[PDB]
Design an enzyme around this catalytic site. Structure first.
Site, short mmCIF file in Angstrom:
data_model
loop_
_atom_site.label_atom_id
_atom_site.label_comp_id
_atom_site.label_asym_id
_atom_site.label_seq_id
_atom_site.Cartn_x
_atom_site.Cartn_y
_atom_site.Cartn_z
CG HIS A 151 -0.40 0.38 2.48
ND1 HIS A 151 -0.08 -0.54 3.46
CD2 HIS A 151 -0.09 1.59 2.97
CE1 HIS A 151 0.40 0.10 4.51
NE2 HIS A 151 0.41 1.40 4.24
CG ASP A 164 -0.04 -3.97 2.75
OD1 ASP A 164 0.53 -3.49 1.73
OD2 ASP A 164 -0.46 -3.25 3.69
N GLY A 166 2.55 6.22 8.90
CA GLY A 166 3.94 6.41 8.53
C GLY A 166 4.90 5.34 9.03
CB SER A 193 2.39 1.79 6.73
OG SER A 193 1.15 1.40 7.28
N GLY A 194 4.85 -0.34 6.29
CA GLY A 194 5.93 -0.80 5.45
C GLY A 194 7.18 -1.18 6.20
S1 LIG Z 1 0.32 2.17 8.45
O1 LIG Z 1 -0.28 1.17 9.28
O2 LIG Z 1 1.26 3.09 9.02
C1 LIG Z 1 -0.96 3.08 7.61
C2 LIG Z 1 -1.75 2.13 6.64
C3 LIG Z 1 -1.89 3.66 8.68
C4 LIG Z 1 -0.21 4.23 6.78
O3 LIG Z 1 -0.13 5.32 7.38
N1 LIG Z 1 0.32 3.91 5.60
C5 LIG Z 1 1.04 4.96 4.96
C6 LIG Z 1 0.65 5.13 3.56
C7 LIG Z 1 1.43 5.48 2.45
N2 LIG Z 1 0.61 5.49 1.40
C8 LIG Z 1 0.85 5.84 0.01
C9 LIG Z 1 0.70 7.31 -0.23
C10 LIG Z 1 -0.56 7.93 -0.20
C11 LIG Z 1 -0.69 9.30 -0.43
C12 LIG Z 1 0.46 10.06 -0.67
N3 LIG Z 1 0.20 11.50 -0.90
O4 LIG Z 1 1.26 12.25 -1.28
O5 LIG Z 1 -1.02 12.05 -0.80
C13 LIG Z 1 1.69 9.46 -0.70
C14 LIG Z 1 1.80 8.10 -0.47
N4 LIG Z 1 -0.64 5.19 1.85
N5 LIG Z 1 -0.61 4.96 3.12
#
Ligand SMILES: *[SH](=O)(O)C(C)(C)C(=O)NCc1cn(Cc2ccc([N+](=O)[O-])cc2)nn1
Ligand code: NA
Length: 240
Positions: free
Chosen positions: A45, A93, A186, A188-189
């Protein structure tokens, strides 16, 4: 990471910051784990949006030059072919990023050790989440890498009705849920590092938290279970 402590500089040398271009600068969006000198393991994601990405290894303080960072482009993105961005709860994921150059290994930059395929941790196994994610629900990113002790919650407990129910699959690891410590946006990953036979290995890729909050009792942080994907990871690396 909510309820964490600041990590020491050399503790988690496989942690990476995945960043995207924002104006004339960069913004941290996700963690990852360096698994080869030219490959990073992250969440699928994290790459759902089509942006210019870079990976930072040897990072500690996002806002200051530490003298230990290496910055590298992303040359290829391989998402798990069963990933469905509209169905995070289905799992899959996970994504591998081939780096544009091989990074140099040193005390700040090391490969993350992956578990043996199939390994499932006993309930309450000792693990740490690391990341620069939000330090409170609806808060802001951490300037310096954070860690928090997040013991696992096994599948039977985590998928029961008072936890995540059917949303959690056996292809995931749950950890935490104490209402104080958690992953957050943030993180995530990034990795969940678990101590097995005296060695930390990366058993999780941070995947999701509750929409009701990062640190919520009985909503542990949910991770892709790395040990379900060892063959997939190796097949990708061998064919690219
Ligand atoms: S995680 O559990 O930390 C979760 C899912 C809550 C999270 O915060 N994921 C982070 C994330 C990164 N992306 C891709 C992305 C979306 C939007 C932008 N933007 O510039 O608007 C950039 C990257 N999605 N979720
Ligand atoms: Na820095």
């Amino acid at each position: 990471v909510v309820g964490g402590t600041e990590a020491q500089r050399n503790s988690w040398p496989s942690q990476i910051s995945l960043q995207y271009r924002s104006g004339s600068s960069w913004a941290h969006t996700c963690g990852g784990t360096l698994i080869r000198q030219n490959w990073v393991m992250t969440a699928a994601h994290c790459v759902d949006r089509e942006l210019t990405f870079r990976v930072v290894v040897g990072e500690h303080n996002l806002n200051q030059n530490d003298g230990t960072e290496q910055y590298v482009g992303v040359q290829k993105i391989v998402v798990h072919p069963y990933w469905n961005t509209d169905d995070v709860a289905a799992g899959y994921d996970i994504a591998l990023l081939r780096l544009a150059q091989s990074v140099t290994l040193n005390s700040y930059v090391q490969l993350g050790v992956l578990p043996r395929a199939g390994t499932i941790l006993a309930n309450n196994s000792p693990c740490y989440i690391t990341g620069w994610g939000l330090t409170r629900t609806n808060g802001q990113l951490a300037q310096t890498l954070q860690q928090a002790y997040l013991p696992t919650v096994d599948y039977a407990i985590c998928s029961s009705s008072s936890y995540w129910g059917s949303t959690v699959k056996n292809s995931m690891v749950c950890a935490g849920g104490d209402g104080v410590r958690s992953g957050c946006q943030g993180d995530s990953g990034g990795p969940l590092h678990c101590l097995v036979n005296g060695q930390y290995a990366v058993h999780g890729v941070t995947s999701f938290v509750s929409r009701l909050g990062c640190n919520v009792t009985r909503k542990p942080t949910v991770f892709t279970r790395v040990s379900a994907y060892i063959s997939w990871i190796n097949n990708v690396i061998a064919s690219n």
